[PDB]
Design a protein around this ligand. Sequence first.
Ligand SMILES: NC(=O)c1ccc[n+]([C@@H]2O[C@H](COP(=O)([O-])OP(=O)(O)OC[C@H]3O[C@@H](n4cnc5c(N)ncnc54)[C@H](OP(=O)(O)O)[C@@H]3O)[C@@H](O)[C@H]2O)c1
Ligand code: SF4
Ligand code: SF4
Ligand code: SF4
Lengths: 111, 176, 370, 296, 106, 147, 88, 206, 138
Amino acid sequence: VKPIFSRDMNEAKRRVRELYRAWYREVPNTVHLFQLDISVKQGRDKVREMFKKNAHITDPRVVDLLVIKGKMELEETIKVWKQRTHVMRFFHETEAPRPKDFLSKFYVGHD
Amino acid sequence: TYKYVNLREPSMDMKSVTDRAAQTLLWTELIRGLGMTLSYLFREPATINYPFEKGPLSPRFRGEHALRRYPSGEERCIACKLCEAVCPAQAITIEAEPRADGSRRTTRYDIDMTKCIYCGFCQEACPVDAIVEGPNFEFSTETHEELLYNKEKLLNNGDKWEAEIAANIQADYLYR
Amino acid sequence: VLRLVMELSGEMVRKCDPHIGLLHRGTEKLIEYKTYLQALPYFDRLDYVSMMCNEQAYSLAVEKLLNIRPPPRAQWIRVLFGEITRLLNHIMAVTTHALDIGAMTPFFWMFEEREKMFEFYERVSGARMHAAYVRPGGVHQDLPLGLMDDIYEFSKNFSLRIDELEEMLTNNRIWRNRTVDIGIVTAEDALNYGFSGVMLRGSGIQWDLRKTQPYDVYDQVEFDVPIGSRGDCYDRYLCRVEEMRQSIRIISQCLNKMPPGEIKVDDAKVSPPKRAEMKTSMESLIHHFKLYTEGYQVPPGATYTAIEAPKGEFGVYLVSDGSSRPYRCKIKAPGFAHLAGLDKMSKGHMLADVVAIIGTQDIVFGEVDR
Amino acid sequence: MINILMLIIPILLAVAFLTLVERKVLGYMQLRKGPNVVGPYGLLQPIADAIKLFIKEPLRPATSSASMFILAPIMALGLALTMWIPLPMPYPLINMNLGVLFMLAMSSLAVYSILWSGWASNSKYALIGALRAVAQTISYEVTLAIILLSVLLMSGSFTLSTLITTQEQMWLILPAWPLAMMWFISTLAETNRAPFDLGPFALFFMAEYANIIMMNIFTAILFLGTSHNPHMPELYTINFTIKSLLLTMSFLWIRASYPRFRYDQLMHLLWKNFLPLTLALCMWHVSLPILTSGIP
Amino acid sequence: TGLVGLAVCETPHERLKILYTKILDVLGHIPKNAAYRKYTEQITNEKLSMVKAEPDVKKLEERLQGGQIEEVILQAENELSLARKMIQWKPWEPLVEEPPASQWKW
Amino acid sequence: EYVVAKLDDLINWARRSSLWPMTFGLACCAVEMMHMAAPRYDMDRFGVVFRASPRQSDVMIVAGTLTNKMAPALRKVYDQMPEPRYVVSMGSCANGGGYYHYSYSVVRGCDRIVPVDIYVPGCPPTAEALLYGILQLQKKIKREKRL
Amino acid sequence: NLMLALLTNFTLATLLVIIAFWLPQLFSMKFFLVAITFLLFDLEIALLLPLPWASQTANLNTMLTMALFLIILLAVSLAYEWTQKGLE
Amino acid sequence: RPTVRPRNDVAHKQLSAFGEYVAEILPKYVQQVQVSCFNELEICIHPDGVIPVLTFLRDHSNAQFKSLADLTAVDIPTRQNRFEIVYNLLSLRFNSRIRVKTYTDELTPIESSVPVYKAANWYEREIWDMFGVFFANHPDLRRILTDYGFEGHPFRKDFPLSGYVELRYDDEVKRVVAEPVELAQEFRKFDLNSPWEAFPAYRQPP
Amino acid sequence: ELLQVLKRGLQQVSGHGGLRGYLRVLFRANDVRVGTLVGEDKYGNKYYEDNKQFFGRHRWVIYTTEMNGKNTFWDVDGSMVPPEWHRWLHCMTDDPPTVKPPTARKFIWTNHKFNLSGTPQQYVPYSTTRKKIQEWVP
Ligand SMILES: NC(=O)c1ccc[n+]([C@@H]2O[C@H](COP(=O)([O-])OP(=O)(O)OC[C@H]3O[C@@H](n4cnc5c(N)ncnc54)[C@H](OP(=O)(O)O)[C@@H]3O)[C@@H](O)[C@H]2O)c1
Ligand code: SF4
Ligand code: SF4
Ligand code: SF4
């Protein structure tokens, strides 16, 4: 069909599963080889919240592009690349962070 | 056009082989290379010590920005936003209000030195010749705040360089 | 400057993947908002070494869009400053290359002469290095009376100064020991990388843009192109010095042929009129008001231009709308081509050879942007 | 015994005042002006570098492994300064039973100075480059022993005092014509940074530049001499210093004029090419005292 | 004598004749109605006549090449690979692919 | 009392004598930084030595443009530097992004990564104007550690 | 004294380290083959060391054949280094 | 005209022969649209087969190009199909410049030019970086000009020039360089667009 | 030839000052040179020229001792020297007090000012607009 991408509907879901195992094994390895930073358990919780935002699945075309991107930004650790605890860090350290409420945001006055 | 870099066998027989071998057995060409720097040592060096001597320049040179004025008082800048739009760094900002009564010449006039890649474009785009680039080198600060130019003021304080600017612009009208 | 991820089997390189782009300034999206006259000084500030060779490719790209020829005088200034950049770049192609190896003298021997070269730039334009001099309307400002006597005065002493390097570097055993036999690539596979300046020109194919495609008054000026035999670092260095000795011929012929006339294009829809002219006449100042702020009002269409850089090419690809802002362009510097060659150039060579590859290709990190 | 302090303090000043020579003489080679602002001709700068690095400059070690890193500069400076003791001069301080054997021994132990510095850093990134720097020094010490013996087998025993007496009418440069060329190159291997280059970091500069003067003097004993004169010590002292200074200019000549030879092709100049040449001349120098009577 | 390129300048005649006769047969396997066979054949037949007439002359190498026989041999070497790829992937013989959306002007 | 005030100036004179800068080739500014070596305008062995080295150097010149890729890279160099460290932001890109600025990749100000003591405003920072940056650094060192 | 001369150099060298320390307050096995050959050649140098100091009382004709013999085999050891040493 | 005209058309009819020659093959698979203006040739290619077009012009008896050197891509949101990958090709033996374009939206993968051209893989990484177009059967697709911790694709006209992650502080944390801060200085949006049409003949009827 | 080189150095030391004068041009000044001097500038500035020496060089010039309020002789930057930088210093051929006169307009500052630096009385940023007015009164 058009266009190919990589997988058709059901096959695209199992490509995410293979991607999930490869990244789950690296988070204990990126403590001793990289840096302690936060925690091994807290690093694994960062994985689950990342896939929840990506969880929609309507077409295999969108899913396949996420796999290629998932084998790049999460690949920035496996083959040993320089980051120095600045790159590949997803969580905000200095975030305020803002909340969504008609009493909290309106008191600060924004938009 | 062709010029050829390859020598294509300089040594052939007996006489041409021995001298090509002599330079590799001992040195010769290294001693010849030693003589190149030897004569280079004796000839006088072209060196300029900055706090006393000064380097060569030109009648038209761009440094720190300073806005000029008319011989009988009056700020030469007319407020157009002309130089604002030409500016490739967007370093220059201009907001204009009427001056007391009648005259309409500037209010906000900030040129960022954090930005500005120095073109002379603002010198060229100006129809009244307000910003003229003077021969400037001396500028060193502790903060960004001290470096970025305020609402004219420090730009108007370019009177110390405006005497040179008036001399340099006399070599600028009907270009060179 | 360069990261360079290395894979070493014992001592020699197996895989050399240059993880570069550490100086991506982001000119791509940035020029899209700027007008044609506003976008001009970006091109000078792209490459760290070439000044008048830059903008030259950009101005001619606008000139191929507008279909308006620059004045006969201004074209001769463009070659006079086009060949003076061929001096500036090929100095740095030798000096910093030798400085990366470990040679101290040839850097400082040439930089005395190179500092005299910026006296020409200062007398012809505001700043030292980068100049908004080459424009779509030809040439911004005419040469002063003092400079034309100085070019002849410089060239007379230059021929001995460049020949001082040959009796210092080429004749010595060290360079015939070090640079000889590093990455001998001259085949159809070498053609499959596309270097244009040097490399293919330096060894193998007799093709050059200078003879085949004229830019501004070419073929009339006598050119000499050095082509070697072996694709090693030494013969790719010899041709650069042979370029330098056979470059003064062009500069002398530029001094011989100078027709007095216009500096900018007389048509005031491309280039701003004279300062004495704009103050009196009406139409001049309105065009001065609209050539600044507002851009050019360019004809729509996609055009590709490439003028010979001493490093390689500046393949500017301007895509134009009816509006004054050019929507997207890419500067095709040879930095993308030269670093791609390191996948083949590093095969069966030491760590010290890698430094010699970068120097002979002259990968100045400003090249890699678009 | 006060003369030992009169051979450390003026020597430490000689390594200090090298900073003038190492960039002014090197400066005129490169057409640049060296020291000028600091002093009348920059004479205040060499002592100013000492106040900068010793007192105010603090330490930031990588790991600091108990005894090491604060032991390597002691081996660096100590071995460089002890080399001055066996030197013949007009008169030597505590003359050894055999001279040149002490000279080759303390230079071969001076390899440790660059060895312990490689062990000081915990990282693997530094030690590979450190062992490469050892290879530059360790390899050339093989030939250094051979070329020494060929000069000795011509005339004199190992004692350095006898080497002055044998050079009465003519220099040893003329009989040892290819061997004199070797000592210009072989000495540059010991961290001179001319054919090949790799607080406590400042102390290594005071030790590495000290060996440069040491090799300049040692070449001016084995090959230079001109006159002895035991009755007049005045004539020898001035004439020896000028000969050593001319060799110091040639050491800074290679640093400016010539690029690095590569580490791999450093083992192609030596071993592949120099070792067959030096031994062939050593074979020649065995036959010389037998062909014609030449025994001390 | 040797060429400037990496390809070795070997003294070989009729080597160009074998490769140019081989490619004519490959073109007459699958495409017949296509214009790709009809146009490429008349250029190759024009070039083959120059080789037969001129015996090892530099003027024969100067015709449509002018970079000796080594450059002309490279043109024949990749010609067999280009013909086999055109025979495998149908594009010249068949035309039935969909048309683009109506937009072109910037 | 008098010896205390005079000895402090002697330590400050040691840095007034010689300053070793870092050779960062991250700019067009870096070519003008190579003009400091060029004989016509020299601070070479007047104070400046081009040996550099990441650890032994006292001064580091941030030459021109810095990207988000080089932002963690230049920071770890600053940590390797000794305690008496001075940072010169030579060039308009180093001062706050001369060009680009509003761009996605270029870091604005340099002070967001590494604190700056001496600012040099010039794009092509003329060697004449570059001579001020070192001379001002020597002048700025006046008094250190009173008690 | 040799003991007094040697110890004075080391004690002054240790003192220079304390000045900087106390005052301020706020893989690849190809290298191994080169190292081994250094040791094996230097032992042949050790046998060839006595030559200028030894040849004074002993007969020259008996020594001449034996003195060159060590240098010949020292070249044969280098002749084995030509039959593929490696990339080094 | 003396200064007004750049060059008179003489080779335009000679280059128009190429506009017929490749079109004489007539594939719906390949040809589609052929545009020729200002001594230059432009061809756009159907997404299904890009590799067979690139094997052509390479070698070939009539025209020898070989060098498929410079590789660009166009971002335009006007059309239903978004991106336009543009190949710039140069001949050494023939001395001519021809253009190869793609018309597809290419959010869905497109065929790679790596087996035909060696240096094409480095340019293909840039298109995946700036534009976000994946190349099928590509060896080593790695980020070059983008940051290691960069979200999205930096060139696309859908998002601003400043971005989302751009400002990098140091402040409170001893070693970690900041990322989540988004604020930057105000880029003045110029609304300079001239009234009246610039040129005739370029005007399209609604 | 050898005697003329040594005699030329002796004439330079004897000309400019003597015993105390030569030391001021050696210790304070980087390079010692003798030639023609204009000697007409604001404060204690000399500005000498006319010397051959090398191309793009206009004599020693010499920095001023106490220019405005710095009171320094050992260390001085390019803050000194009045409007003459574009004149005999680098660009123009005619000397500022000899041939080419400075133009009077009564707008330029009479007393020359030094560099701002980190010292007090330096450069500063300032607001310009009066902003949107808002007022509330009982
Ligand atoms: N972890 C703990 O130790 C701990 C536990 C419980 C509570 N706290 C609280 O948290 C605070 C920690 O602060 P800290 O000890 O980290 O500060 P600190 O390091 O002592 O720094 C204070 C700075 O202020 C200056 N300063 C203070 N008083 C001065 C004076 N009279 N004259 C001149 N200079 C003066 C000093 O400069 P000079 O050095 O130049 O004089 C010093 O650099 C304390 O105030 C304490 O109440 C700390
Ligand atoms: S500087 Fe000139 S162009 Fe700019 S606002 Fe003032 S008068 Fe207008
Ligand atoms: S010189 Fe250029 S960047 Fe600077 S204010 Fe003028 S137009 Fe803007
Ligand atoms: S300030 Fe100018 S010269 Fe310096 S890096 Fe930026 S663009 Fe280049």
